Symmetry: C5
Subunit: 258 residues, 5 copies
């Protein structure tokens, strides 16, 4: 039961941070990149290495203790940090033609963010149910051919960084009552990154009843994926490239019953 909003100067707080991408980081020089992508010769033999798999980013942010009152997330400012870095077309890339500049980062992208008063709830869906996911990742267990469309057994919480592969999990639409999520998948080899930045855009997190996410245990959950596309090396080999996401969340104290 949700009651009145607390007023006064000390009834509002602000959370501001960046969430770094988790693309796989195949070596000590390649933070923000995945391992080069290899292709299995059969569906059965699909066994992607961990460093070749982008994962969901998550941050649990402790808020000022209130221990009743709960912090209510009201607004979000967000954007991708470092969009201009993708203009580097001179770092040993693949020339688009004889004497031309390097092919810029492009192709399949997934841009996603969520704000919640608890962990993002996930539903597993697999492109290929026989894909063998690597040690150190948390993936849909007991997969069947029905996992390729919908298997209700695959429920999870995004409760660990560098663990939940993007391609395995989506937000669970049957749950997430205490989270607001937003995502766009743009698929295609030649898809151009279109990345907007501005400090003038605000997203309201209140639902139809004027209630935003309520932070259980005084914790705010922020989640992100920003796979911008792929970088193509001189050799033709391709790596996912990701960027950090900025979050600014304004919260207010709200009284709750039971």
């Amino acid at each position: 039961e949700v009651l009145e909003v607390k007023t006064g100067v000390d009834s509002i707080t602000e959370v501001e941070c960046f969430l770094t991408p988790e693309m796989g980081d195949p070596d000590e020089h390649l933070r923000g990149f995945s391992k080069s992508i290899s292709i299995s010769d059969t569906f059965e033999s699909d066994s992607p290495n961990r460093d070749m798999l982008p994962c969901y980013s998550v941050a649990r942010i402790p808020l000022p203790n209130l221990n009743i009152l709960m912090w209510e997330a009201v607004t979000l400012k967000t954007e991708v940090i470092g969009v201009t870095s993708l203009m580097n077309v001179h770092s040993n890339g693949q020339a688009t033609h004889d004497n031309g500049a390097g092919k810029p980062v492009q192709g399949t992208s997934f841009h996603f963010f969520s704000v919640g008063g608890e962990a993002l709830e996930l539903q597993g869906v697999l492109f290929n149910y026989r894909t063998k996911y690597p040690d150190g990742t948390i993936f849909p267990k007991n997969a069947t051919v029905q996992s390729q469309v919908m298997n209700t057994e695959h429920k999870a919480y995004l409760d660990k960084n560098k663990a939940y592969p993007v391609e395995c999990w989506v937000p669970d639409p049957t749950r997430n009552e205490n989270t607001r999520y937003f995502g766009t998948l743009t698929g295609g080899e030649n898809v151009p990154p279109v990345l907007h930045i501005t400090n003038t855009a605000t997203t309201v997190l209140l639902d139809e009843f004027g209630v935003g996410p309520l932070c259980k245990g005084d914790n705010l959950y922020l989640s992100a994926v920003d796979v911008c596309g792929m970088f193509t090396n001189r050799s033709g080999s391709q790596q996912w490239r990701g960027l950090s996401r900025y979050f600014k969340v304004q919260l207010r104290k709200r009284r709750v019953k039971n």
Copy 2:
């Protein structure tokens, strides 16, 4: 059918929540959500697609709490495609886009469609090629003529069965469907990129200009979907339709009706 007042109170509302799985053809035990590889006929007259190569409309008839006159009225819809990120698997028997590159992602012709109604979706048949021989186990336009390629009014049907009505044969009948709200987009082309948005903050209102939503006859709600996302190209170059499930959340209210 005279529409009267909406019932109020705690017990005057109900909620329907479910998913509709895609029916792309499922050519073997490992390929649920895919069609059979697409083959091309030598001539127009020899077009004879196998059943597992034809995506079909999905449909669910959902029984609602018995009311009886009162009818359940569908007011709002939340919907989205489930598993959009699976299309990031470009490492599973795909065709490299160039030497040493990643696999070609799912792309090309897509049809995304959903409808909410108080009765079965009404269909009109339109054929690309009237001489196409459609396979046993599918329900297709019968007594086809050359006019079926543009508009033959004989081809009327109800979306009343799963794995049955091929997408390429049927569209919602715009001359009917008074008690249904439907929404669809065909994006054609070999290289069309999937653009798939997800969010739990978007609601579609199902009320018409008179403030009346679909009215559920016999206390049944009808949900229909097609989500052909594009084609997957395997290493050999052969191509298969790939579909994904669609989530539906519908809010309904009790409404009194006369006669």
Copy 3:
């Protein structure tokens, strides 16, 4: 002089119909298609076959007799019928690559519809003024080089089916006071068809003074072109492909003077 709208039960009527496309119909099996498209060696030698030229569609629809009172067209629901037929990529098409599916219908499209209380008024504009238009078509007469940009002599009414080729006629913006018209040309070889369907979308036909088309002699004129693109056969030859268009028009009785 436009006076008051009549109210009451019988003061409204509805028109519902479909207009079939006229793409050329080169044989008894190819309704909805044009003949294969060929290319003349020069501008002077351009002589398109009748069945290679899509034409405007028109329907004159008689309304309930009134007599002053006139039927006023207020709203329109419209959509292209059979959009899913374009998913037939298995019928004598050209493979996109080795082992691939058939190339779908794509390329130059023209989607157009109008609702009027009289025939759609046309202005002729020619891509090439030396084009010889074939017997059985109604085309701009006494063409000069100025016809390639604007020759005011080329005035016509869309008053016949299978007659007015799409490529040499457009709605006359200097006239059509009693018609509401809407069209989009999307040109280019590889342009993807984007076709939306819904029964929830209504277009209001009233002008800035709140007055819709007024039906002279109790006739409603509906016009359409839906060239969806080109179908490419095995050999690589290309044919225009069209689809039918649904119209639902709501009309009301309006009193007019003189």
Copy 4:
């Protein structure tokens, strides 16, 4: 100072016309086309011929004479506009280059510029040059005394669009530091394979009033209409390419407004 609008039946007027494109017209058969585009041997030797340079179109339209007695001005309030002959681009059967073996001709596509303006005086222009060493041909009016700075911004390059078939599109843009008495709208879409997307309707109106509710005020009772509609390039069988343009329709509603001094 801008005062009250005059009312009554004769306090309103309408201007309706079309502006033809000026693409270069290389011969007696090619109105609406430019000459085939040729590429200079070196960057410094860029020297386009007049008939391969599209130019801005302009018409000055006389309005009903005001102030016969010993001040009223016509004020432009609304605009209806569209490109005339959009369907002509469906001619893919006339001396074109096939898109593939046995295919239809390549349609008009690629770099486009669609522009229109309505003003109570000539459209004011600012010159910007892609290449300052380009030699612009006799018969055109172009930025003079060009320097390397002309490639980005040289404030010397000021002009009025006061002549048809004269001001090359590639040299000139509306001057944003001026044009207080004009409303202008333009879109450049660059790229070799850009699809023309051309909408037509008689239901769309642009309001020409500024934030104070004042439209262009017609000095000397003259209305200035300007346009560019380069739709893209037509590619012939040989592969040579020509700009293709189309006419633009204008309908402007005007009202009498009283002005001080």
Copy 5:
């Protein structure tokens, strides 16, 4: 503390100017262009030359002097802005690379970044590197003490845009953790074949007020304008490619606001 807006005729002022692009300018003839883009032999040896790197543009404009007697600040309320010389990109004849045999030259296209900001102080920057092992050249101001973490987020890389021709576009973005006194807007469109889409009009206004109705407040009576308008790349006959940029127009309306402490 922000108090009331001052009214009267002298309580408003206007700033109008153009910001020229800084693309590299490799020689005396190539203002608005970068040096041709070279590719490093290995990933770790990335070493772009100065004239190959587009930089952020910045202008600080002095406003009418306030507080002559012993606080009023200029408040930026509205902005009109557009790219100047969009039509110049229609020059497809200046020794470019023919799209096909006998075709016109390939137009400027590909990766673009269009950005602008209005603030009462220097735009605040955060550094993000595509490749932390990139050696950035003398004459540029770049993220120092780069680590592998610089490829995603290294909070050490803070800077002010306080110098023209200095801060490379690829190294720096607006810092979203700062910039309280600035309004910024930017779009990156990446990809070799990306078509430039450039709109111009004198009828579009951006309001600079925040949710509390307060615009940028100009410290020391100075207005800061920043821009990047990399439109894409020009391809030479030989296939070599150069960034091409254009100038940006700014018109800013300001009002006097009283401030406490």
